[PDB]
Amino acid sequence: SEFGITRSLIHSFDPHGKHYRPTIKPTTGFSASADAERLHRSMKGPGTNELAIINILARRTNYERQEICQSYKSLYKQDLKDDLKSDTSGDFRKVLCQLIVDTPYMLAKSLYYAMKGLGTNDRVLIEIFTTLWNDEMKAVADAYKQVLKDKGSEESERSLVTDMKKETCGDYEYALLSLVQAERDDIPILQLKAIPDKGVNSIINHELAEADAKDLYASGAGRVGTSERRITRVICNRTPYQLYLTSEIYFKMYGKTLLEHIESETSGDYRKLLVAVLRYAIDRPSLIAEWLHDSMAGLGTKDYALMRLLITRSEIDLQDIMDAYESIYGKSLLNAVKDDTSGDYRRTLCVLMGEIY
Amino acid sequence: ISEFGITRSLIHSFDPHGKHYRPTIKPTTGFSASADAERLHRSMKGPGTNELAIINILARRTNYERQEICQSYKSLYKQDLKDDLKSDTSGDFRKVLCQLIVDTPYMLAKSLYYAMKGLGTNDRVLIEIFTTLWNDEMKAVADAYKQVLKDKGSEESERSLVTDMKKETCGDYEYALLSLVQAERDDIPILQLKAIPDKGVNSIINHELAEADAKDLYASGAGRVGTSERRITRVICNRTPYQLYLTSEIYFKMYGKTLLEHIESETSGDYRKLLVAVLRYAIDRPSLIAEWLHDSMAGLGTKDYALMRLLITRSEIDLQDIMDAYESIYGKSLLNAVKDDTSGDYRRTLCVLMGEIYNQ
């Protein structure tokens, strides 16, 4: 994998140092080989044993999935991704392809489709960029060049940045480019590992949050819109832990929540990006619950958001998101999904959420 | 008087089938600019502003009449109606009053200015406004914009509406947006428009053009990766509402998929929303604006100008038809939704625009 054994630990903890809860965790006694073989068995003769496939690929991490792919290749000298692609069809084949691909490639490909169609699917850009930290973003960028090649791009130096709108297009586009640069505030692995011990004071900074609050507060108004970067410089660079602190300080000081301030001072996609990044730090389960809810518009595989989100969030925080969703909507996420989808595609999603078949 | 002239352009005036759209505000055949001026003037004298009197005039006149009233009041009292209303009212009431006594094109230009001058871009507002302007209106707004820039400081005798917009290289949405602001959409001469109830919409559309357009529209899908696809933009943004409707019908008979569906599956982002807005402005307008009004009611008051902008503007064009659609769609009158989302003399002003007059 290009993402290592796990997504960045930066994503693993709520504002308070509490482990988010995934629906998928590395599999005790995992054997790529065992799984490769079992998958091989599940594709045979007329038809296919779909549930067998699901109960493996939808119960492993991206890293384990890639190990399986590598084991499969080694063994059968065949290609897992293809073997699946030939014996499945429709929506089920679609979700399987999103599953057997390395995460950064699966995201890079979505970014590719969001930009290369008619009109720019910014919702997807915002959705995906919000969820990547520096190293992941870099892996996604590299995956992107590989996607262009896989599409037969004859261009030597086409790139993610190359395909994106120019910073001069506006505040939103500049912020997007800022994030792609992949130079947000980072936390050493040591510190992150220790969050569930020392808590979070070690990785935040009051003098900083307080100063940033002052900057955030003084950013806005008209007459001067010449490169107003302060809001971007803070929201799009501070760690989720630091942003939370800034958020707390800002409300104590000013009497309006930092979120309300953003919603009031910015517009269009720029606002949507800022709101996404901030809520991903201070209000994530709800943010992604809402995203999931919006993704369910009876489109099936016509829109990828639903499966992209379930697949990715399954190994980070999908369970907390499931809980948020029910609180917000009165219906379990599991049921919303059962209602909006069908077939083996549906079964895959339910298993990703922890359902058993 | 008004850079829009006595009315909004007649090109907005008929539905796809040739029937007149129904406004909540029509030119008053007994209209006396001076008489209204006098009445407004009385309303303000003394420390007891009669809000109902003010609202029941200004919110019951077209933009042309309101401007006629401004002028008459100016010559009559050496005083500026706008100023006198501002100094005699406050809060949300003053806000809505200011949107109202300003010439439509200036009012739209100010909102465009704010949609761009701030942090990020209020594209929703650009789509909403540009969608609703035909060529001459657009040019009047462009002019008024230059006048907003002077009013707001700029000493740049050459900065304009297009200067402030995003460049066409920023993407399909931006390019399409710019094409509307180009103000080179197909025209229909007034005389032929006025004749529609006589001659029918058939006299004003082109079956052969629609077929050819329908084919170009369908082609925009194969080899979706080559050069910048502009054909959808050209057709959707330029055809008159009447031609687009015909194009929509013909497109469906040929391919068994609505033109809307086609657009919705082939395009994304603000580009889709702009195209969808423009198409629906032609073929599904009452519903389209009823939804716009619905989405504009989020309890923001005079912090979001969309609700009052839409009401003010649609009032003299097709607001009644939009009201019917609104209740069909949402199961509740637009009147009652508006009353629930607003209050004060502002609420009252909005209600009067839709026709609900309360006398004293």
XYZ file of C-alpha atoms in Angstrom:
717
model
C 0.000 0.000 0.000
C 1.004 3.640 -0.498
C -0.801 4.570 2.731
C 1.107 2.291 5.082
C -0.581 -0.216 7.385
C -3.064 2.449 8.450
C -4.512 5.834 7.657
C -2.654 8.582 9.523
C -3.170 8.480 13.271
C -3.944 12.187 13.001
C -7.451 11.035 11.986
C -7.874 8.532 14.852
C -8.827 10.763 17.799
C -11.694 13.116 18.581
C -11.024 16.653 19.828
C -10.647 15.160 23.341
C -8.152 12.373 22.688
C -10.824 9.720 22.579
C -10.295 7.011 19.945
C -12.804 7.267 17.133
C -14.355 3.836 16.572
C -13.945 2.073 13.208
C -16.118 -0.762 11.908
C -13.029 -2.455 10.457
C -9.759 -3.071 12.324
C -6.720 -5.115 11.332
C -7.624 -8.803 11.424
C -6.061 -10.851 14.226
C -4.193 -13.766 12.664
C -4.591 -12.246 9.216
C -3.312 -14.407 6.362
C -3.202 -12.721 2.978
C -2.459 -16.156 1.564
C -5.448 -17.814 3.209
C -7.720 -15.046 1.978
C -6.261 -15.020 -1.531
C -6.960 -18.766 -1.778
C -10.500 -18.441 -0.429
C -11.189 -15.668 -2.903
C -9.824 -17.843 -5.677
C -12.235 -20.591 -4.623
C -15.209 -18.201 -4.601
C -14.817 -17.550 -8.321
C -15.625 -20.805 -10.126
C -17.910 -22.400 -12.696
C -21.142 -20.721 -13.846
C -22.016 -17.781 -11.606
C -20.096 -16.754 -8.497
C -20.255 -16.960 -4.691
C -20.619 -13.241 -3.992
C -21.253 -13.387 -0.243
C -18.002 -15.300 0.266
C -16.160 -12.509 -1.536
C -17.902 -9.799 0.482
C -17.289 -11.431 3.854
C -13.584 -11.195 3.172
C -12.918 -8.007 1.146
C -15.457 -6.035 3.216
C -13.963 -7.250 6.505
C -10.303 -6.359 5.868
C -8.381 -3.065 5.922
C -7.071 -1.424 2.759
C -3.644 -2.690 3.756
C -4.822 -6.269 4.238
C -6.756 -6.002 0.977
C -3.569 -5.001 -0.838
C -1.651 -7.847 0.817
C -4.361 -10.166 -0.473
C -4.016 -8.708 -3.964
C -0.252 -9.243 -3.782
C -0.657 -12.766 -2.455
C -3.240 -13.559 -5.146
C -0.946 -12.360 -7.941
C 2.034 -14.313 -6.607
C 0.009 -17.515 -6.437
C -2.225 -17.657 -9.440
C -0.056 -15.373 -11.566
C -3.443 -13.823 -12.330
C -4.583 -10.369 -11.297
C -7.093 -10.211 -8.430
C -8.698 -7.013 -9.696
C -9.323 -8.540 -13.134
C -10.447 -11.946 -11.888
C -13.118 -10.146 -9.888
C -14.023 -7.792 -12.712
C -14.783 -10.702 -15.054
C -16.989 -12.813 -12.771
C -19.086 -10.010 -11.277
C -21.292 -7.369 -12.862
C -23.386 -4.273 -12.337
C -23.251 -2.353 -9.075
C -21.515 -5.195 -7.298
C -18.599 -5.147 -9.697
C -18.471 -1.364 -9.198
C -18.077 -1.534 -5.442
C -15.574 -4.366 -5.670
C -13.356 -2.250 -7.902
C -13.409 0.527 -5.311
C -12.482 -2.032 -2.706
C -9.516 -3.901 -4.308
C -7.769 -0.666 -5.248
C -5.226 0.982 -2.932
C -6.985 3.875 -1.170
C -4.900 6.692 -2.693
C -5.597 5.341 -6.189
C -9.305 4.993 -5.470
C -9.360 8.601 -4.271
C -7.128 9.830 -7.079
C -9.483 8.253 -9.599
C -12.513 9.983 -8.040
C -10.636 13.298 -8.196
C -9.883 12.496 -11.828
C -13.562 11.976 -12.640
C -14.568 15.018 -10.611
C -12.316 17.230 -12.736
C -12.362 15.712 -16.229
C -16.117 15.630 -16.803
C -18.182 18.580 -17.980
C -18.183 21.028 -15.117
C -16.170 20.500 -11.951
C -17.606 18.278 -9.243
C -16.280 20.419 -6.404
C -18.351 18.562 -3.789
C -16.082 15.586 -4.400
C -12.929 17.722 -4.324
C -13.994 19.203 -1.016
C -15.056 15.821 0.322
C -11.775 14.120 -0.493
C -9.221 16.866 0.170
C -10.754 17.512 3.599
C -9.932 13.941 4.627
C -6.295 13.773 3.631
C -3.313 14.740 5.723
C 0.072 15.720 4.145
C 1.557 12.257 3.494
C -1.759 10.852 2.313
C -2.267 13.855 0.063
C 1.158 13.190 -1.421
C 0.293 9.550 -2.011
C -2.935 10.675 -3.640
C -1.070 13.096 -5.908
C 1.298 10.322 -6.988
C -1.612 7.986 -7.535
C -3.159 10.665 -9.727
C -0.244 10.708 -12.182
C -0.594 6.932 -12.366
C -4.308 7.317 -13.133
C -3.608 9.677 -16.019
C -1.155 7.117 -17.456
C -3.601 4.294 -16.905
C -5.980 6.375 -19.051
C -3.342 6.588 -21.792
C -2.362 10.188 -21.131
C 0.552 10.860 -23.496
C 1.501 13.913 -21.434
C 4.759 13.650 -19.519
C 4.143 16.204 -16.804
C 0.374 16.403 -16.353
C -0.403 16.331 -12.636
C -3.081 16.768 -10.020
C -2.000 20.373 -9.544
C -1.893 20.722 -13.327
C -5.455 19.532 -13.693
C -6.735 21.820 -10.929
C -8.043 25.341 -11.370
C -5.453 28.121 -10.947
C -5.021 29.985 -7.668
C -6.021 33.188 -9.462
C -9.482 31.753 -10.052
C -10.261 32.667 -6.442
C -10.119 32.155 -2.692
C -11.579 28.632 -2.930
C -9.213 27.589 -5.667
C -6.217 29.032 -3.777
C -7.225 27.189 -0.617
C -7.551 23.987 -2.620
C -4.060 24.484 -3.988
C -2.807 25.221 -0.475
C -4.074 21.832 0.706
C -2.679 19.986 -2.291
C 0.722 21.402 -1.419
C 0.409 18.994 1.508
C 2.122 21.264 4.014
C -0.447 21.475 6.837
C 0.806 21.467 10.451
C 2.032 17.974 11.293
C 2.337 16.007 14.532
C 5.219 13.528 15.063
C 4.042 9.881 15.184
C 5.318 9.696 18.759
C 2.972 12.449 19.914
C -0.017 10.976 18.076
C 0.666 7.495 19.488
C 0.539 9.046 22.947
C -2.697 11.024 22.596
C -4.688 8.274 24.420
C -2.235 8.689 27.307
C -1.154 12.271 27.895
C -4.271 13.495 26.160
C -3.943 16.453 23.849
C -2.246 19.345 25.692
C 1.068 18.138 24.284
C -0.059 18.727 20.723
C -1.864 22.072 20.997
C -0.783 25.637 21.725
C -2.838 28.330 23.495
C -0.732 31.319 22.564
C -1.148 30.131 18.958
C -4.884 29.367 19.080
C -5.497 32.676 20.840
C -3.462 34.596 18.272
C -5.198 32.762 15.426
C -8.555 33.614 16.972
C -7.541 37.275 16.747
C -6.574 36.818 13.079
C -9.764 34.900 12.265
C -11.758 37.658 13.992
C -10.151 40.451 11.971
C -10.567 38.731 8.590
C -13.500 39.845 6.447
C -15.141 43.088 5.325
C -14.986 44.585 1.837
C -12.967 47.143 -0.129
C -9.876 44.979 0.388
C -10.177 41.478 -1.039
C -6.632 41.456 -2.379
C -5.377 38.026 -1.318
C -7.144 37.683 2.028
C -5.341 34.509 3.087
C -5.480 34.643 6.906
C -8.592 32.511 7.174
C -7.185 29.923 4.766
C -3.767 30.080 6.472
C -5.389 29.052 9.775
C -8.304 26.756 8.918
C -6.285 24.835 6.295
C -3.037 24.404 8.227
C -3.812 23.734 11.894
C -4.240 20.177 13.071
C -7.759 19.104 14.037
C -6.695 19.246 17.688
C -5.366 22.784 17.335
C -8.435 23.934 15.370
C -10.729 22.682 18.093
C -8.830 24.749 20.656
C -8.997 27.770 18.385
C -12.710 27.154 18.091
C -13.153 27.044 21.869
C -11.124 30.162 22.435
C -12.869 32.041 19.679
C -16.311 31.462 21.212
C -15.176 32.347 24.738
C -13.693 35.584 23.438
C -16.193 36.709 20.835
C -19.545 35.198 21.765
C -20.080 33.801 18.284
C -18.871 30.309 17.338
C -15.970 30.187 14.886
C -18.197 28.134 12.603
C -20.946 30.793 12.563
C -18.284 33.411 11.820
C -17.035 31.458 8.830
C -20.549 30.861 7.512
C -21.171 34.575 7.847
C -17.936 35.913 6.286
C -17.482 33.585 3.334
C -19.542 32.321 0.401
C -19.826 29.590 -2.223
C -17.342 26.764 -2.443
C -14.817 28.688 -0.370
C -17.235 28.620 2.523
C -18.061 24.979 1.883
C -14.375 24.034 1.970
C -13.729 26.028 5.166
C -16.834 24.623 6.859
C -15.837 21.091 5.870
C -12.273 21.362 7.220
C -13.406 22.941 10.489
C -16.264 20.519 11.143
C -13.941 17.650 10.259
C -11.930 18.819 13.240
C -14.693 19.813 15.676
C -17.886 18.085 14.493
C -16.828 15.135 12.335
C -19.336 12.351 13.010
C -22.180 14.711 12.178
C -20.368 16.240 9.203
C -19.841 12.863 7.573
C -23.281 11.641 8.649
C -24.757 14.587 6.739
C -22.446 13.850 3.790
C -23.676 10.250 3.749
C -27.258 11.417 3.960
C -26.781 13.752 0.983
C -25.072 10.975 -0.929
C -28.241 8.894 -0.701
C -30.305 10.303 -3.568
C -31.287 7.058 -5.274
C -28.384 7.057 -7.726
C -26.778 3.703 -6.935
C -23.400 3.403 -8.635
C -24.201 6.500 -10.707
C -22.688 8.471 -7.822
C -19.675 7.165 -5.898
C -19.934 9.224 -2.690
C -21.830 6.604 -0.648
C -19.408 3.735 -1.223
C -16.324 5.953 -1.226
C -17.240 7.281 2.206
C -18.294 3.940 3.744
C -15.198 2.204 2.383
C -12.751 4.868 3.610
C -14.400 5.736 6.908
C -14.866 2.053 7.842
C -11.297 1.801 9.163
C -11.287 5.147 10.968
C -14.528 6.397 12.500
C -17.483 4.837 10.648
C -19.067 3.603 13.899
C -19.186 7.080 15.509
C -20.606 8.305 12.220
C -23.269 5.589 12.317
C -24.240 6.764 15.799
C -24.303 10.413 14.766
C -26.444 9.597 11.777
C -29.241 7.998 13.783
C -29.244 10.899 16.325
C -29.553 13.386 13.486
C -32.023 11.583 11.223
C -34.036 9.238 13.445
C -33.115 6.314 11.206
C -30.085 4.048 11.505
C -27.484 4.641 8.797
C -27.656 0.901 8.164
C -31.377 1.225 7.320
C -30.986 4.360 5.218
C -28.498 2.404 3.126
C -30.688 -0.710 2.921
C -33.484 1.557 1.706
C -31.425 3.367 -0.935
C -29.519 0.385 -2.390
C -29.976 -3.212 -3.571
C -28.349 -6.512 -4.463
C -24.824 -7.571 -3.607
C -23.813 -3.910 -3.794
C -26.085 -3.371 -0.794
C -24.736 -6.409 1.050
C -21.194 -5.108 0.664
C -22.152 -1.795 2.215
C -23.956 -3.450 5.131
C -20.992 -5.705 5.834
C -18.631 -2.694 5.758
C -20.838 -1.261 8.494
C -20.548 -4.497 10.513
C -23.648 -6.412 9.337
C -23.288 -10.206 9.105
C -24.446 -12.496 6.272
C -36.118 57.277 -15.194
C -35.238 53.573 -15.319
C -32.430 51.828 -17.209
C -34.849 48.930 -17.596
C -37.642 50.977 -19.145
C -41.362 50.800 -18.353
C -41.164 47.028 -17.973
C -38.926 44.016 -17.698
C -38.324 42.664 -21.173
C -41.365 40.972 -22.785
C -39.212 37.954 -23.496
C -39.965 36.851 -19.872
C -43.672 37.485 -20.245
C -45.074 34.317 -21.781
C -44.929 30.692 -20.662
C -43.657 27.941 -23.002
C -47.147 27.601 -24.498
C -47.635 31.301 -25.153
C -49.904 32.080 -22.184
C -49.079 35.244 -20.200
C -47.320 34.747 -16.877
C -49.209 36.366 -14.011
C -47.511 39.003 -11.833
C -48.626 40.271 -8.419
C -47.809 43.852 -9.458
C -49.092 45.409 -12.685
C -48.712 48.994 -13.917
C -51.467 51.076 -12.336
C -53.577 52.615 -15.101
C -54.495 55.505 -12.785
C -50.836 56.010 -11.785
C -49.992 59.440 -10.378
C -46.313 59.802 -9.549
C -46.934 63.155 -7.882
C -49.946 61.926 -5.916
C -47.919 59.003 -4.580
C -45.015 61.342 -3.865
C -47.352 63.584 -1.854
C -48.719 60.634 0.095
C -45.254 59.310 0.893
C -44.270 62.804 1.953
C -47.199 63.080 4.374
C -46.329 59.658 5.787
C -43.019 60.942 7.094
C -43.794 64.414 8.502
C -43.649 64.492 12.302
C -42.251 61.987 14.839
C -44.683 59.248 13.813
C -43.734 57.411 10.629
C -46.718 55.699 9.020
C -45.106 52.466 7.828
C -48.304 50.926 6.433
C -48.822 53.985 4.224
C -45.305 53.746 2.852
C -45.479 49.993 2.250
C -48.918 50.069 0.653
C -47.581 52.388 -2.034
C -43.993 51.348 -2.789
C -44.650 47.597 -2.474
C -47.685 48.003 -4.767
C -45.911 49.732 -7.709
C -43.634 48.435 -10.468
C -39.988 49.467 -10.581
C -40.795 51.988 -13.324
C -43.509 53.593 -11.193
C -41.311 53.614 -8.075
C -38.584 55.436 -9.996
C -41.253 57.736 -11.410
C -42.126 58.400 -7.787
C -38.513 59.101 -6.793
C -38.264 61.687 -9.575
C -41.571 63.367 -8.806
C -40.738 63.546 -5.102
C -37.338 65.042 -5.961
C -38.668 67.902 -8.084
C -41.510 68.374 -5.605
C -39.622 68.574 -2.321
C -36.025 69.320 -3.261
C -35.505 66.186 -1.188
C -34.289 62.702 -2.101
C -36.887 59.950 -1.476
C -34.164 57.394 -0.838
C -32.508 59.570 1.838
C -35.787 60.546 3.475
C -36.888 56.928 3.714
C -33.508 55.930 5.120
C -33.514 58.609 7.789
C -37.149 57.912 8.742
C -36.893 54.095 9.045
C -34.409 51.582 10.408
C -33.457 47.930 10.668
C -34.901 45.329 8.321
C -37.602 47.704 7.189
C -34.990 50.197 5.983
C -33.102 47.353 4.274
C -36.069 46.187 2.255
C -37.077 49.771 1.497
C -33.650 50.415 0.030
C -33.788 47.386 -2.260
C -37.194 48.654 -3.354
C -36.631 52.376 -4.193
C -33.457 51.689 -6.138
C -33.720 51.101 -9.897
C -33.847 47.342 -10.516
C -30.535 47.208 -12.422
C -28.641 49.051 -9.652
C -30.203 46.803 -7.053
C -29.072 43.727 -8.959
C -25.608 45.174 -9.525
C -25.105 45.853 -5.812
C -25.965 42.229 -4.971
C -23.579 41.050 -7.717
C -20.905 43.288 -6.258
C -21.353 41.756 -2.801
C -21.498 38.221 -4.206
C -17.986 38.736 -5.574
C -16.246 41.331 -3.399
C -16.313 39.196 -0.256
C -14.440 36.060 0.739
C -15.166 33.316 -1.759
C -17.826 33.753 -4.417
C -21.554 33.621 -3.914
C -22.119 31.678 -7.113
C -25.631 30.775 -6.115
C -26.389 34.484 -6.361
C -24.580 34.803 -9.729
C -26.595 31.897 -11.137
C -29.853 33.222 -9.673
C -29.416 36.728 -11.061
C -27.744 36.108 -14.450
C -30.238 33.384 -15.314
C -33.000 35.993 -15.099
C -31.492 38.723 -17.300
C -31.884 38.991 -21.038
C -29.497 40.943 -23.260
C -30.626 44.528 -22.685
C -31.261 43.972 -18.975
C -27.816 42.451 -18.603
C -26.186 45.499 -20.229
C -28.176 47.799 -17.950
C -26.908 45.801 -14.977
C -23.349 45.886 -16.299
C -23.637 49.659 -16.575
C -25.117 50.001 -13.138
C -22.277 47.858 -11.789
C -19.711 50.376 -13.033
C -21.748 52.949 -11.102
C -21.635 50.789 -7.966
C -17.841 50.664 -8.244
C -17.702 54.455 -8.290
C -20.098 54.658 -5.365
C -17.985 52.191 -3.361
C -14.644 53.942 -3.837
C -12.945 52.584 -6.974
C -11.054 55.258 -8.905
C -10.458 52.718 -11.672
C -12.319 54.275 -14.595
C -12.139 50.926 -16.411
C -12.923 48.156 -13.905
C -16.229 46.441 -14.730
C -18.590 43.557 -13.933
C -16.604 41.186 -16.155
C -13.330 42.328 -14.584
C -14.625 41.074 -11.254
C -15.900 37.741 -12.531
C -13.835 34.604 -12.749
C -12.044 34.082 -16.088
C -13.335 31.513 -18.587
C -10.177 29.454 -18.187
C -11.298 28.677 -14.640
C -13.694 26.067 -16.038
C -16.919 25.176 -17.812
C -19.070 26.960 -15.238
C -17.068 30.181 -15.475
C -17.074 30.160 -19.243
C -20.854 29.624 -19.327
C -21.309 32.336 -16.709
C -19.315 34.733 -18.927
C -21.440 33.852 -21.961
C -24.558 35.056 -20.168
C -22.796 38.279 -19.207
C -21.785 38.636 -22.881
C -25.447 39.597 -23.485
C -25.494 37.931 -26.918
C -28.333 35.482 -26.348
C -30.820 35.045 -29.208
C -33.346 37.843 -29.427
C -36.948 38.159 -30.517
C -38.047 41.592 -31.655
C -40.683 43.228 -29.475
C -43.310 43.335 -32.207
C -43.179 39.575 -32.659
C -43.309 39.011 -28.908
C -46.339 41.302 -28.519
C -48.033 39.260 -31.241
C -47.685 35.932 -29.447
C -51.251 35.826 -28.091
C -52.353 36.386 -31.699
C -49.878 34.305 -33.643
C -48.834 31.749 -31.059
C -45.422 30.661 -29.878
C -45.107 28.667 -33.126
C -44.516 31.976 -34.896
C -41.521 32.649 -32.682
C -39.604 29.341 -32.601
C -37.520 27.402 -35.167
C -38.166 23.676 -35.553
C -35.165 23.142 -37.807
C -32.813 24.901 -35.371
C -34.210 22.866 -32.455
C -33.593 19.586 -34.292
C -30.027 20.587 -35.110
C -29.504 21.770 -31.553
C -31.009 18.559 -30.243
C -28.418 16.608 -32.231
C -25.459 18.682 -31.013
C -26.701 18.261 -27.468
C -26.799 14.478 -27.848
C -23.316 14.331 -29.382
C -21.876 15.935 -26.218
C -21.035 12.643 -24.509
C -19.017 10.478 -26.876
C -15.285 11.118 -26.627
C -15.866 13.002 -23.384
C -12.238 13.964 -22.744
C -11.074 15.657 -25.939
C -11.504 19.409 -26.322
C -13.465 21.835 -24.137
C -17.104 20.951 -24.795
C -18.916 24.223 -25.496
C -21.915 23.007 -27.493
C -24.152 22.481 -24.483
C -23.325 25.972 -23.261
C -23.949 27.643 -26.578
C -27.388 26.064 -26.926
C -28.642 26.248 -23.340
C -27.373 29.765 -22.597
C -28.367 31.382 -25.908
C -31.689 29.998 -27.115
C -34.742 32.003 -26.150
C -36.954 30.419 -23.511
C -39.451 29.542 -26.271
C -36.808 27.901 -28.503
C -35.376 25.952 -25.522
C -38.764 24.539 -24.752
C -39.226 23.358 -28.326
C -35.674 21.992 -28.143
C -36.556 20.132 -25.015
C -39.625 18.508 -26.630
C -37.793 17.541 -29.805
C -34.863 16.210 -27.845
C -37.140 13.815 -25.976
C -39.032 12.508 -29.002
C -35.686 11.679 -30.632
C -33.739 10.131 -27.762
C -36.330 9.043 -25.182
C -34.573 10.931 -22.391
C -35.445 14.468 -21.248
C -32.995 17.223 -22.112
C -32.961 17.994 -18.382
C -32.049 14.395 -17.543
C -29.340 14.550 -20.150
C -27.833 17.705 -18.700
C -28.139 16.355 -15.168
C -26.209 13.182 -15.972
C -23.505 14.703 -18.178
C -22.479 17.743 -16.171
C -21.496 18.427 -12.580
C -20.975 21.172 -10.034
C -22.060 24.763 -10.549
C -21.901 24.126 -14.272
C -24.798 21.680 -13.941
C -26.676 24.042 -11.631
C -26.263 26.964 -14.036
C -27.395 24.870 -17.046
C -30.270 23.410 -15.028
C -31.317 26.855 -13.849
C -31.306 28.261 -17.401
C -33.206 25.299 -18.898
C -35.768 25.321 -16.110
C -36.118 29.082 -16.406
C -37.456 28.224 -19.825
C -39.381 24.969 -19.356
C -40.297 24.791 -15.648
C -40.033 28.327 -14.324
C -42.739 28.526 -11.653
C -41.355 25.436 -9.906
C -37.734 26.536 -10.312
C -38.251 29.889 -8.639
C -40.613 28.385 -6.018
C -37.686 26.180 -5.009
C -35.328 29.141 -5.054
C -37.677 31.000 -2.735
C -37.938 27.910 -0.478
C -34.170 27.602 -0.222
C -33.873 31.322 0.458
C -35.955 31.002 3.620
C -33.478 29.845 6.240
C -34.300 32.329 8.985
C -31.444 34.662 8.066
C -33.602 37.779 7.764
C -32.032 40.738 5.986
C -28.681 38.959 6.265
C -29.507 37.104 3.043
C -31.053 39.243 0.319
C -32.302 36.428 -1.906
C -35.849 36.246 -0.540
C -36.553 39.936 -0.942
C -34.632 40.149 -4.272
C -36.733 37.348 -5.747
C -40.031 38.752 -4.455
C -39.275 42.305 -5.613
C -38.206 41.180 -9.082
C -40.740 38.400 -9.748
C -43.586 40.542 -8.508
C -43.946 42.396 -11.785
C -43.332 39.316 -13.939
C -44.617 35.950 -12.826
C -44.831 35.860 -9.032
C -48.496 34.717 -8.905
C -47.639 31.666 -11.002
C -44.686 31.047 -8.735
C -47.004 31.265 -5.720
C -49.319 28.582 -7.138
C -46.362 26.304 -7.839
C -44.991 26.933 -4.376
C -48.134 25.654 -2.636
C -48.416 22.652 -4.965
C -44.862 21.674 -4.186
C -44.503 22.385 -0.499
C -48.088 21.983 0.762
C -48.061 25.469 2.266
C -48.632 28.954 0.811
C -45.605 31.087 -0.062
C -47.380 33.807 1.902
C -47.375 31.639 5.038
C -43.790 30.435 4.520
C -42.677 34.041 4.201
C -44.586 35.085 7.319
C -42.939 32.247 9.206
C -39.403 33.177 8.130
C -39.619 36.952 8.607
C -41.196 39.623 10.819
C -41.689 43.313 11.413
C -42.385 45.882 8.719
C -40.037 43.845 6.547
C -42.366 40.827 6.699
C -45.265 43.170 6.021
C -43.480 44.656 3.015
C -42.838 41.196 1.541
C -46.486 40.210 2.071
C -47.706 43.307 0.255
C -45.446 42.581 -2.717
C -47.311 39.256 -3.098
C -50.647 41.060 -2.881
C -51.663 40.717 0.763
C -52.446 44.354 1.597
C -53.373 45.275 5.171
C -55.079 48.643 5.547
C -55.001 50.866 8.638
